[PDB]
Amino acid sequence: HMSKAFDLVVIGAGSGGLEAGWNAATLYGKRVAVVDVQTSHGPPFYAALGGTCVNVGCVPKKLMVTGAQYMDHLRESAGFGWEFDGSSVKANWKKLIAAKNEAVLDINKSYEGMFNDTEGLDFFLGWGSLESKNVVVVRETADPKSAVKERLQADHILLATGSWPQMPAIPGIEHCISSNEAFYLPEPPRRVLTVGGGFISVEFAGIFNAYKPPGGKVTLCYRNNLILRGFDETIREEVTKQLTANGIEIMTNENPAKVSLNTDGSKHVTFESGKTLDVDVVMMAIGRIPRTNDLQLGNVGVKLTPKGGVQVDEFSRTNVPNIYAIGDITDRLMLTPVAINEGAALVDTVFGNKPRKTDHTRVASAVFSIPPIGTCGLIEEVAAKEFEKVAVYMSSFTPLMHNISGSKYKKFVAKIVTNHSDGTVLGVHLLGDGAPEIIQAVGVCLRLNAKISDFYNTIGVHPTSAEELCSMRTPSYYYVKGEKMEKLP
Amino acid sequence: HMSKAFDLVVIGAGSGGLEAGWNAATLYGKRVAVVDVQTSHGPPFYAALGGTCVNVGCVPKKLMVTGAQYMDHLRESAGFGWEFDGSSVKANWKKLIAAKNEAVLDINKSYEGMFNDTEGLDFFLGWGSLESKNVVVVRETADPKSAVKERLQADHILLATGSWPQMPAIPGIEHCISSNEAFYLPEPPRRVLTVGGGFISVEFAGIFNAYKPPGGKVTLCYRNNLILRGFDETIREEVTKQLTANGIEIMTNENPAKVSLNTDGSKHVTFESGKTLDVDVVMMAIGRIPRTNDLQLGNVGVKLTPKGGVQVDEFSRTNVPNIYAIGDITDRLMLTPVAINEGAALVDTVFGNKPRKTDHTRVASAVFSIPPIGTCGLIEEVAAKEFEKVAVYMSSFTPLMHNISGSKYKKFVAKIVTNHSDGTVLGVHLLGDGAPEIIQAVGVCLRLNAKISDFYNTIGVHPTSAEELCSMRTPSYYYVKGEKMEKLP
Ligand SMILES: Cc1cc2nc3c(=O)[nH]c(=O)nc-3n(C[C@H](O)[C@H](O)[C@H](O)COP(=O)(O)OP(=O)(O)OC[C@H]3O[C@@H](n4cnc5c(N)ncnc54)[C@H](O)[C@@H]3O)c2cc1C
Ligand SMILES: Cc1cc2nc3c(=O)[nH]c(=O)nc-3n(C[C@H](O)[C@H](O)[C@H](O)COP(=O)(O)OP(=O)(O)OC[C@H]3O[C@@H](n4cnc5c(N)ncnc54)[C@H](O)[C@@H]3O)c2cc1C
Ligand SMILES: O=C([N][C][C]C1=[C][C]=C(F)[C]=[C]1)C1=[C][C]=C([C]N(C(=O)N2[C][C]N([C][C][C]C3=[C][C]=[C][C]=[C]3)([C]C3=[C]C(Cl)=C(Cl)[C]=[C]3)[C][C]2)C2=[C][C]=C(F)[C]=[C]2)O1
Ligand SMILES: O=C([N][C][C]C1=[C][C]=C(F)[C]=[C]1)C1=[C][C]=C([C]N(C(=O)N2[C][C]N([C][C][C]C3=[C][C]=[C][C]=[C]3)([C]C3=[C]C(Cl)=C(Cl)[C]=[C]3)[C][C]2)C2=[C][C]=C(F)[C]=[C]2)O1
């Protein structure tokens, strides 16, 4: 019936909080408490022990995109001489969802095990909030009036509560779902609208498109001209064509104004334009917002940015000296490995006596579109605002295997962006099979300040898509003080 | 006086020959003649315009491995909810061969077009040999007494005739085939013996295993204890295990003593051990030897190594001034990209004022086994004879998608070999889906003298197999003065 005392209390057992907690306890012998709202994935709170990534993010979406790729594989097999009864082919969504659920539960169960087993690393179930500088309260619900399960005394407090889907305030929003519900749909939708131009909308569009019943149709809508803002424009344009080529309708310059129920219970969507669409599911994927609401940060005066994130310095420190924030709650790069790196850096700094800041530049990342994106570093239009002379090396071709497969639309894109003044690689952008696998080691290259000549003097592995990166010596074009041109004056 | 005058005569229109020829003409404005024995692929001379890679190597074999992969994709799809009539599934070899033939013939025609469209680059059909220091004779056939077609006066001669399958001197060797004939088999063989432990025997075993008719069996035999000599030991053991899991019988410590014809037109193999096996096809893949016999190298005194390669210095010069050799004929690294690099280097040296030598260390390479190998730099047993303290970082697991697919045997292997005294990455060895793509940029990393800490300080792309390379911090074991031990002494 007594409070417990820790060196470190972590609110959120996800990618950042688990890295921080494990490292503090096992590398530096600190007493660590980690709080989360649920021990295993799914409703009601979706995220759980292991975080968004394990439960309703990276791990399950990747298993589901892997399942969806078999639609391409089954059709593309025919060109290589594979024969079977095409009329017999069915996509069983319930088996996919059941296989994903057992894989996720197995990870939930192993994290549970690590906590029951490790010296000075304890798990507390419930909703963590800040009572004071040195006390974390664990309550039965997000409501600050719900019953107190524990009070955790903390010399240091880490906020790592991640993010949550954003729902626009439109009439009939209650007829719409987020990515969270999409993971548990009992049946694959015949007709689905995915709202948003980001990786989550694109990734789900691919998944629904493979698993849709026979009469089915996937529509993606986006309020602006071109999906996947922040990615290379050539790649943005090519992914649009390859989604369309695979039967996904892309509605750009369109946004839902309202949703109502038809008498048959299907969703009637009215866009701002006055266009209408009937679907069985409306999935909002317009963005994710920092999960700061439930932490009662007012109790200790932890400052939020204008945009809603916990404000931090380069060492993840809030304005309250012993309170830190890492991961999606800081509203910057929303990636698992960035959250993990921030967690490991924080603990080495606070407990390890070896200060270290996370480098947020030159981070490798992927989109598991079909086919996928792999990217690291600057897109050319950003490079062009910070460097007087920028060169772009571009190779774009239908791979030979896709001339046999019949997916001629599957153009491989490889782009390298440089500072032409010294040849430093600023950015590498890939579209096509293996692009996420190719881009990891490119991340090491950029952290070692690689120049285009470091790439072109490296001997290719043949035959691969990757060898295109080691075969480009003459720019396709330049930017000179922000202006695009084929040649230097 | 028809005879014609050239700066460079290249014998062999292959990987190395065409790089050299193209660069000499388009970069250095030289007069270039290139000789090959055939304009397009296949019987009777197999190699042709484009070289071994284009016609009977890398390109057709990758397309045929892509075909073989579909056997795994169709089975694995079931775990992700794909349902279809398994009984109706058949692999059509003839359709694969015809699709490969059209892809390759398109490349042959494109190279024809390249000669026609390029100034100072001329193609001659026929058999090239050395008449004197500065004359290349082109005859109708490999016979030195056949009709002369051209006599090419040349300031510089490039030997680039590549390699040829080694056939052992055993009774009934004439009832055996090589990789050359494998590319044109009218029917997929029902029982086949691939002879050799190297990458060609392993790749073909996979190809024949996918396309074998019902009741068929692929056997691979190797004269020593463990296949794929020169690859990482862990990967050699695991690929052996994974080939066995996919139904390929691996016969180690076995070597054909003789082959005889059976009355049904099948082959009767007797091993040195006294064991016997009946097969439809015996594919010998025990090695490749330099293609030097038809060149009449005795006419000018070009020196050969004891092994049969054309002896060259670091700049690809023979003992005879103004005569060079690149690619497989030099019997060093038999990889297309290495031949291409040597060709470029040679032309830069001879006709630029840019003396360049090919670095034959830290060349990335692949085996298109199912699943595949990607490797760059030293295996631990070679590292441990050149360095006092070697650390080995090792990661080995079934990827989660293969727990769902049911191919539980598909262990991904990642190994980093370091100079432990200073953390320098010496070698990276990968077995798993994507390994050939993951390894290309690793090639670039080893030219920026990456340390293990440069890998583990790089932020991961999640979820990928590749991120394993950025997640290994602690050696699994070491070699100290050549001797393996789990701990530093
Ligand atoms: C659909 C989807 C796909 C994604 N795909 C990828 C991808 O492929 N690659 C990638 O790198 N990233 C991906 N992401 C992003 C990645 O999931 C996040 O960047 C990462 O999980 C954030 O880690 P974190 O530690 O900040 O928070 P999280 O991992 O979100 O963990 C926060 C935890 O805190 C808990 N929590 C919240 N409030 C409280 C409270 N008051 N008390 C206690 N516990 C609380 C939550 O239950 C959760 O478990 C994806 C995200 C989504 C939604
Ligand atoms: C089955 C197989 C698979 C392979 N897979 C790969 C792989 O995946 N990756 C890789 O990097 N390497 C691979 N290789 C090796 C690769 O093909 C060679 O290393 C490369 O082609 C060698 O280039 P080269 O310029 O030395 O000769 P080649 O490309 O062989 O060119 C030699 C040319 O000379 C011609 N010729 C020969 N004698 C004469 C003469 N007297 N006069 C005129 N012309 C002549 C031939 O017709 C031929 O076109 C593979 C090899 C084989 C056999
Ligand atoms: O498919 C693919 N990819 C993937 C991989 C592979 C391959 C093959 C196979 F079978 C499978 C798979 C492809 C297709 C194509 C290609 C290439 N390319 C490209 O752009 N590239 C370029 C080239 N390279 C470099 C240079 C060299 C030279 C130049 C001139 C003359 C002669 C020579 C080469 C190469 C080649 C090849 Cl094939 C590869 Cl793969 C790589 C590399 C670069 C490239 C191209 C494009 C387009 C066209 F139309 C053509 C072509 O790709
Ligand atoms: O499947 C796969 N692969 C491929 C990719 C993928 C994923 C997912 C999906 F869905 C699909 C696909 C896998 C499985 C598993 C793995 C890994 N691992 C390994 O062994 N590793 C280790 C871990 N990691 C690293 C480290 C970190 C940590 C530690 C401790 C605590 C905490 C943390 C993990 C990670 C990392 C990173 Cl970088 C990120 Cl970003 C995330 C995560 C890894 C390695 C493991 C194994 C086994 C088990 F059971 C589990 C796991 O894999």
Residue numbers in the entry:
A (entry chain A), B (entry chain B): 0 to 488
Study text:
Trypanothione reductase (TR) is a suitable target for drug discovery approaches against leishmaniasis, although the identification of potent inhibitors is still challenging. This homodimeric flavoenzyme possesses four cavities binding two nicotinamide adenine dinucleotide phosphate hydrogen (NADPH) and two trypanothione molecules. Each NADPH cavity is separated from the trypanothione active site by a flavin adenine dinucleotide (FAD) cofactor allowing the transfer of two electrons by the participation of two catalytic cysteines (C52 and C57) which, together with H461′, E466′, and E467′ of the γ-Glu site, form the catalytic machinery.
To validate the predicted binding mode for further rational structure-based drug design and ligand optimization, the structures of TbTR with the most promising compounds 9, 10, and 14 were determined by X-ray crystallography. The effect of N-piperazine substitution on binding affinity was assessed by introducing a methyl or a diClBn group in B to afford quaternary ammonium salts 9 and 10, respectively. Remarkably, 10, endowed with a completely new chemotype and a Ki value of 0.2 μM, stands among the most effective LiTR inhibitors so far developed. From the interaction network, it is clear that the furan and the ethyl-p-fluorophenyl groups anchor 9, 10, and 14 to the Z-site, consistently with the binding of the initial fragments. It is also evident that the dichlorobenzyl group—when present—protrudes toward the MBS together with the phenylpropyl moiety, making a T-shaped π-stacking interaction with W21. With regard to selectivity, the binding of the optimized fragments 10 and 14 is probably allowed for hGR despite the presence of the bulkier side chains in hGR compared to those in TR.
